[PDB]
């Protein structure tokens, strides 16, 4: 060891919503835990979250966790593991009420209970009338949640390593993950964080696209790290394009706009969603509302303007009093980035890259999975994953609005509750040798030595453009095969890319370079995946295979990093407390 070694029982890489619930939970179970974050914990993408948390509290109306389980399984287009969705939807209410006790400042009903708003794909009585179960704090719910969890980690004296960039996972000689090497952004020091549990909580990867609702920091870091360690990723082709991103900006306006009574109009003033989804209307599934807006533009019925092609989101009818109280956050977002006042005039909106449904395959415990040579699941000892970087999978092919925040809290907490059994189950793990650690540093050393290679700026711009064009809302086998060819080219260019700033005192260039590597593996894993799946399920929409193929593709897709091929994994359809929901034709 010629590196400093910092030992903990658990290292949580990422201080977003899910990292911080996990860290807080591991910590209260009397285990030492290091919380890393490449930004200050409250700058994590979770802060930008708006709509709220979907959960059968049953405050606005009588509700039932099974109805929410139904909504989700259907929402997922029948490839969400149902044992997991059952766990989530059922645990939900207590797990969220816990946050309200932590001081989270939820909005209120007149009687004093947590406010719940209507949201996309929510129904009473298993596919019946429109429900309202998205608990919220105005439209700043993610902010409210993150800041509360930070405060809770402050109260509980969690060891937080703010502004450290995790480089890569360290594997011992048994193929077990025993921590990770990380770079301290402030000072440039590189250290080995040794652990018996390494928990990846590194959020999403919107920045593989040209236009995304995601923060600049969403660079699929966990996907890269996991792929390079030979850990498979799953369902990488499932990319949620949020219906209402602001046209020409990418900054999200919430689904809570439609949930509060707002609706989508085309150039002729037709509420086109009544045609596309006659029951649920504008509160249909996101992949459906997404495609609906695109079909509208793609046939000349979209509007233009300084914003580019878009549909309109009409809100003005809800009144000043309700907009400034329930949705004041999008009011500022619209005025700033669209120069449009939603109290007077509709917001310009186009489907934008939003949420990564895929990620590292996990058990409910948060334990990370791989497959053996026979295709069976085996646990990756010492590796765990929670949050957006996880593919549990509770979202399958399309995530419901307000279900990601639930995901974070429920599985973050679960990973902590279950960490002691998980360490005991995997047994003691052998020490990493000095070469094992050195291997984690190989990636970083390459950039620190490459002075004359390619400008990474152009490599990035190439990458994002390629994804935008070839792997968007609609896809065809032709464009996808060519898109993959260019990615093999761009990935070559990156192996010879130059780091232009050589300094150590807070060198943001080095970070953004290391991020690019992660953008690459994430774009690649998505591209190889979307090619493999020859059907149309949820967000994944092929012209050349427009039918949902329940006979061949009622499964998860799995990218195998070592041989760079694909394979499938079972969807789980055995809930413990009720019978499964069978696959049927899904229309809104």
């Amino acid at each position: 060891m010629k590196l400093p070694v910092r030992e903990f029982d658990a290292v949580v890489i990422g201080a977003g919503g899910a990292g911080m619930r996990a860290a807080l939970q591991i910590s209260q179970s009397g285990q030492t835990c290091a919380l890393l974050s490449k930004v200050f914990p409250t700058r994590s993408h979770t802060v930008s979250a708006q709509g709220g948390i979907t959960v059968a509290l049953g405050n606005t109306h009588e509700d039932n966790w099974e109805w929410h389980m139904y909504d989700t399984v259907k929402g997922s287009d029948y490839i969400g593991d149902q044992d997991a969705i059952e766990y989530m939807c059922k645990t939900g209410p207590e797990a969220i009420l816990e946050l309200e006790h932590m001081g989270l400042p939820f909005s209120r009903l007149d009687d004093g209970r947590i406010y719940q708003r209507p949201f996309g794909g929510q129904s009473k009585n298993f596919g019946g009338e429109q429900a309202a179960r998205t608990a919220a704090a105005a439209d700043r719910t993610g902010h409210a949640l993150l800041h509360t969890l930070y405060q809770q980690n402050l109260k509980n004296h969690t060891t937080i390593f703010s502004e450290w960039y995790a480089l890569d996972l360290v594997k011992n000689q048994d193929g077990a993950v025993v921590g990770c090497t990380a770079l301290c952004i402030e000072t440039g020091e590189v250290v080995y964080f040794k652990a018996r549990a390494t928990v990846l909580a590194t959020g999403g990867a919107g920045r593989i696209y040209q236009s995304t609702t995601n923060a600049h920091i969403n660079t699929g870091d966990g996907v890269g790290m996991a792929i390079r360690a030979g850990v498979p990723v799953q369902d990488m082709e499932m990319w949620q394009f949020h219906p209402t991103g602001i046209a020409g900006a990418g900054v999200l306006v919430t689904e809570g706009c439609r949930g509060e009574g707002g609706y989508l109009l085309n150039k002729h003033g037709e509420r086109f969603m009544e045609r596309y989804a006659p029951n649920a209307k504008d509160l249909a599934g996101r992949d459906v509302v997404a495609r609906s807006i695109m079909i509208e533009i793609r046939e000349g019925r979209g509007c233009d303007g300084p914003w580019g092609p878009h549909a309109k989101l009409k809100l003005d009818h809800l009144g000043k009093e309700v907009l400034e109280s329930r949705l004041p956050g999008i009011l500022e977002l619209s005025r700033t980035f669209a120069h449009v006042d939603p109290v007077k005039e509709p917001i310009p909106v186009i489907p934008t890259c939003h949420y990564m449904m895929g990620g590292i395959p996990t058990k409910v415990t948060g334990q990370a999975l791989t497959v053996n040579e026979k295709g069976e699941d085996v646990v990756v000892p010492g590796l765990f994953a929670v949050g957006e970087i996880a593919c549990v999978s509770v979202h399958g092919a399309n995530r419901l609005g307000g279900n990601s925040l639930l995901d974070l809290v429920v599985f973050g907490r679960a990973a902590g509750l279950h960490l002691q059994e998980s360490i005991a189950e995997q047994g003691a793990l052998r020490d990493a040798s000095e070469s094992d650690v050195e291997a984690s540093l190989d990636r970083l050393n390459r950039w620190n030595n490459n002075r004359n290679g390619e400008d990474p700026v152009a490599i990035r711009k190439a990458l994002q453009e390629c994804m935008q064009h070839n792997f968007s809302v609609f896809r065809e086998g032709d464009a996808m095969a060519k898109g993959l060819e260019q990615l093999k080219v761009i990935r070559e260019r990156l192996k010879n890319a130059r780091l232009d700033d050589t300094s150590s005192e807070f060198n943001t260039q080095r970070v953004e370079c290391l991020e690019l590597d992660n953008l690459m593996e994430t774009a690649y894993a998505t591209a190889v995946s979307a090619n493999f799946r020859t059907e149309s399920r949820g967000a994944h929409s092929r012209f050349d295979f427009p039918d949902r193929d329940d006979e061949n593709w009622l499964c998860h897709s799995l990218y195998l990093p070592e041989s760079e091929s694909m394979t499938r994994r079972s969807v789980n359809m055995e809930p413990k407390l009720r019978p499964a929901f069978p696959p049927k034709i899904r229309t809104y």
Binding site: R108, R113, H143, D500, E505
Partner: protein, 238 residues
């Protein structure tokens, strides 16, 4: 059209002291961009320029800067609001904090005052609720204008009293947070809290200078918050 910037630079491994460097950027005439767009592009030209940013939508609080003399967030300040005829756009770190590198400041002391006011719900556990704590929309209203704070530091690093005693005076940001728990109807520790703000510096170094209010990217008002804190302190200790 051409834009000129005078931007604060400093590297302790290179620079003896800090210096202003000049920058030009060719921008699209008919498009208006944000300062952060300009900074991002300047790093394509000069990779050594270091600065914080994330959400790029004025929610996360990462990119607080002193722009043409006044604090704000780069991500939400338009080029047009800064650009003047024949004058450079002058970008400098937040005032009063240790510069780590270029436009990055050590926020240490800003966080440390935040930690000092115990910014977490403190409920004694007596008469616990069946489910959630019950809060009437009336009482929840009192948290509006307080919980939205993004810890961007703009207000505190524009307060003289904070400059002079950054480790003894809580500062606008801190005091805003303090009041956020002082009037939360779910927090039972109000007296205990007030007793920890009764000294000469914690609260009473605020003199209503009102730099705090003018700069807040989220248009909150620390002055009015501190007013209510003082009120409560007189109510209790006078």
């Amino acid at each position: 059209m051409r834009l000129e910037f005078s931007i604060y630079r400093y590297n302790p491994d290179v620079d003896d002291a800090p210096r202003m460097q000049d920058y030009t950027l060719e921008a699209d005439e008919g498009r208006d961009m944000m300062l952060l767009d300009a900074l991002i592009q300047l790093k394509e030209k000069d990779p050594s320029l270091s600065f914080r940013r994330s959400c790029r939508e004025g929610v996360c609080g990462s990119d607080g800067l002193n722009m043409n003399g006044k604090n704000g967030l780069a991500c939400i300040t338009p080029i047009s609001a800064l650009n003047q005829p024949g004058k450079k756009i002058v970008i400098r770190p937040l005032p009063g904090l240790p510069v780590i590198r270029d436009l990055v400041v050590d926020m240490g002391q800003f966080y440390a005052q935040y930690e000092k006011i115990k910014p977490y719900l403190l409920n004694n556990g007596q008469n616990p609720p069946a489910r959630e704590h019950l809060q009437m929309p009336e009482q929840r209203e009192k948290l509006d204008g307080l919980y939205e704070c993004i810890l961007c530091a703009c207000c505190s690093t524009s307060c003289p009293s904070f400059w002079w005693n950054p480790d003894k005076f809580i500062g606008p940001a801190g005091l805003l947070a303090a009041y956020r728990f002082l009037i939360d109807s779910r927090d039972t520790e109000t007296d205990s809290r007030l007793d920890g703000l009764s000294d000469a510096f914690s609260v009473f170094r605020c003199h209503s200078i009102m730099n705090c209010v003018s700069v807040c990217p989220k248009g909150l008002n620390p002055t009015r918050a501190i007013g209510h804190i003082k009120s409560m302190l007189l109510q209790r200790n006078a």
